[PDB]
C-alpha cells in the first residue's frame, strides 16, 4: 500500500488513488445543482455556515469569470479559487489575442487541462474541488463540469456533493426544452431545501446565479428577493 502516496504512480489495477481520494473531498461537501434552459443557465448552491456572526456574501461559492460566464465551486473553496483565477486569465487572453469572448466549450477544456496537469507530477497534489462552468457566448447557453481528474463533460442538468443521488432523481422530472429561468429558480431552490440534512448542518443559506436573455447575457447573482 505504498502505491497511494503520490499522484505520479499507477496501482496494479490501473488506478491513480490520490485522485480518487481528492474526489472523496468533493463528495462530502455541500450540494450544488444547475440547469440549462432555452434562455440561459441557472446555478444554485448550499452554503453551510460555521458561525451565526458572518456578514452576507462571506465565503461565496459563485464567481464571474467574464461578462457572459461564471463558475460555481464544490468541495474545497480555496482550491476552487485557484481555478477561478486561471479561468479569468484564459477569458482575458481570448479577448486580448483573438478578439472574441471565449466560447463555453473552449473555456471548459482549458480548465480541464489545467486540473489534469496536477495529477501527473510527484511534487503537486490534485485539486479537491469540482467546478461547474456556465456560459452564454456565440455558441449558445452551455453548462459543463470539470472534476479533480481533469475530466470534462456537458450537461442539461447536474448535481454535485453529498445530496447528489437524491437531487439527480428530482432533476430528471424537469422538461429542459420548455422551462424558463424564473421557473428554474423556484424548482432548483426547492430541491436544495429538501435534501438539506437538519441534524448535521444547522445553519445554511442558498446562493443563486444566472446568465440569460433577461439579463442581456450578463452572468450575475439573482436579486435576494427571488427566493
Amino acid at each position: 500500500t505504498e502505491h497511494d502516496q503520490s499522484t505520479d504512480i499507477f496501482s496494479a489495477d490501473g488506478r491513480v488513488f490520490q485522485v480518487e481520494y481528492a474526489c472523496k473531498a468533493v463528495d462530502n461537501g455541500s450540494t450544488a445543482v444547475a440547469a440549462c434552459c432555452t434562455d440561459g443557465v441557472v446555478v444554485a448552491v448550499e452554503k453551510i455556515l460555521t458561525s451565526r456572526m458572518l456578514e452576507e456574501g462571506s465565503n461565496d461559492r459563485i464567481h464571474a469569470v467574464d461578462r457572459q460566464a461564471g463558475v460555481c465551486i464544490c468541495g474545497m473553496l480555496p482550491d476552487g479559487r485557484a481555478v477561478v483565477s486561471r479561468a479569468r486569465a484564459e477569458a482575458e487572453n481570448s479577448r486580448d489575442v483573438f478578439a472574441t469572448p471565449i466560447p463555453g466549450s473552449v473555456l471548459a477544456s482549458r480548465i480541464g487541462e489545467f486540473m489534469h496537469v496536477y495529477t501527473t507530477h510527484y511534487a503537486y497534489r490534485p485539486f479537491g474541488c469540482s467546478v461547474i462552468i456556465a456560459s452564454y457566448a456565440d455558441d449558445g447557453p452551455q453548462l459543463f463540469v470539470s472534476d479533480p481528474s481533469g475530466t470534462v463533460a456537458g450537461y442539461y442538468g447536474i448535481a454535485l456533493g453529498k445530496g447528489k443521488t437524491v437531487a439527480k432523481t428530482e432533476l430528471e422530472k424537469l422538461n429542459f426544452k420548455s422551462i424558463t429561468c424564473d421557473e428554474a429558480v423556484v424548482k432548483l431552490t426547492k430541491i436544495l431545501h429538501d435534501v438539506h440534512d437538519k441534524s448535521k448542518d444547522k445553519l445554511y443559506e442558498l446562493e443563486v446565479a444566472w446568465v440569460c436573455n433577461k439579463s442581456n447575457c450578463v452572468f450575475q447573482h439573482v436579486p435576494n428577493d427571488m427566493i
Binding site: V97, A99, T100, S105
Partner: protein, 228 residues
C-alpha cells in the same frame, strides 16, 4: 505597389498590381501580393517583401491552430487583431502596410487597414502602397456603396490601371480575388488587355511641339521630322 480592398453587398474584392522592384529595375514582373490567411480571409501586402512574407506566414499559422481548437471557421476581426499585434510589436524594425479582408457569417464582408505604425482601422474601402496617392481622388469622385460583385471587380480593375499608368513603381498584371459565401474567385488581367493606359488614350497620341523647324515666323506649328 498598388493594393486595395473594397466592400460590396455580401463580401469583398481585393486587387493588386504584380511588380516588385529595387527602385529602377524590375526583379519580378509577376509577383502575387494577395496572400491567403484562411479559406475566406486574405491580405494585401506592401513594403518590404521579406517582412510581409514573414508576418503573413506567422499569422496564418496561428489562425489554423485556432480553427482546430474551436472546430469553427474564423472571423475577419480575429485575423486583423493577430496581424495588428505583430505589426505593432515590431514597428521599428519593419516596413509594412497591410490590408486584411474577408467574409464571415457573423459580420459579412469586412475590410481592415493596418498602416505603418501598427494602428487598426475598420472601413468600407482601403488603399495602400506608393500608387494609393493617385487613387484618393478617383474614389472620392466615382465610388458608391452597394455595388454588386461584378460592378466591384470591374471598378477595382479600372482603379488599379489608373494608378499603375502614372506610378513607375507599379505595373504588370492586375490580380483580383472576390470573397463571399460561395467559392473564392480569382482573376488575372494581362497588360495587353488593361482597361486603361496612357499609350492608347487618344488625348496623348499627338506629340507636344518641342522641336519646331528654323523659320521666318514666330508661329508654332509642327515638329521637324526630316533634315533640311
Amino acid at each position: 505597389t498598388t493594393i486595395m480592398a473594397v466592400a460590396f453587398k455580401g463580401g469583398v474584392v481585393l486587387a493588386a498590381d504584380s511588380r516588385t522592384s529595387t527602385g529602377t529595375y524590375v526583379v519580378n514582373r509577376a509577383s502575387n501580393k494577395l496572400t491567403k490567411l484562411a479559406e475566406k480571409i486574405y491580405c494585401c501586402r506592401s513594403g518590404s517583401a521579406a517582412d510581409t512574407q514573414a508576418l503573413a506566414e506567422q499569422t496564418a499559422n496561428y489562425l489554423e491552430s485556432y480553427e482546430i481548437d474551436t472546430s469553427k471557421p474564423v472571423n475577419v476581426t480575429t485575423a486583423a487583431n493577430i496581424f495588428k499585434k505583430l505589426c505593432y510589436m515590431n514597428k521599428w524594425n519593419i516596413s509594412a502596410g497591410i490590408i486584411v479582408a474577408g467574409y464571415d457569417p457573423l459580420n459579412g464582408g469586412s475590410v481592415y487597414s493596418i498602416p505603418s505604425g501598427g494602428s487598426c482601422v475598420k472601413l468600407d474601402y482601403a488603399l495602400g502602397g506608393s500608387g494609393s496617392i493617385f487613387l484618393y481622388s478617383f474614389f472620392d469622385a466615382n465610388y458608391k456603396t452597394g455595388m454588386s460583385k461584378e460592378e466591384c471587380v470591374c471598378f477595382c480593375q479600372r482603379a488599379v490601371a489608373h494608378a499603375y499608368s502614372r506610378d513607375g513603381s507599379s505595373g504588370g498584371l492586375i490580380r483580383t480575388i472576390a470573397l463571399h459565401q460561395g467559392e473564392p474567385e480569382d482573376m488575372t488581367i494581362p497588360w495587353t488587355k488593361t482597361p486603361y493606359c496612357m499609350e492608347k488614350d487618344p488625348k496623348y497620341r499627338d506629340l507636344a511641339v518641342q522641336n519646331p523647324p528654323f523659320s521666318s515666323s514666330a508661329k508654332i506649328t509642327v515638329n521637324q521630322s526630316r533634315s533640311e
